[PDB]
Symmetry: C2
Subunit: 87 residues, 2 copies
């Protein structure tokens, strides 16, 4: 059925290297990570800064969008509710 033992003719190794696998996927997550080889967790160093800072940006970001959304919303509602004799 199989020469060596390890597993049963199925994927070798086990859940001890699954990281490196996903890591590779992460390796591409940060395209600059290549010039910043920070140890095997090099993607983790940036992965942790991203989810954190990246998330912070979204909050503050959408924050200016929700405010701007209301502006042009009521802003255009006046630019259109005024033109056509109104003064």
């Amino acid at each position: 059925m199989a020469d060596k033992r390890a597993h049963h003719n199925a994927l070798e190794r086990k859940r001890r290297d699954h990281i490196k696998d996903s890591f590779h996927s992460l390796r591409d997550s940060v395209p600059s990570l290549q010039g910043e080889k920070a140890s095997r967790a090099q993607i983790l160093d940036k992965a942790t800064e991203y989810i954190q800072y990246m998330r912070r940006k979204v909050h503050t970001l959408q924050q200016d969008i929700d405010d701007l959304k209301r502006q042009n919303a009521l802003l255009e509602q006046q630019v259109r509710a005024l033109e056509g004799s109104g003064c």
Copy 2:
């Protein structure tokens, strides 16, 4: 100077577990990761989806902010450049 060898009375282990260390930091990156224990790389599974999807949101996000920014910008420039006799 030191009983066992391993290192020189300094931090034990070496650069073979530095991940788990940063990992712990990542463990908090995803607060829901706890209910989604996806193997040691469990934070990587989400860390990779975040940097990717999270980044995608920013692009599309700021996209609606740059457009909304120009709106209320020219929108208010008319709401103010019209009031005061203009019809």
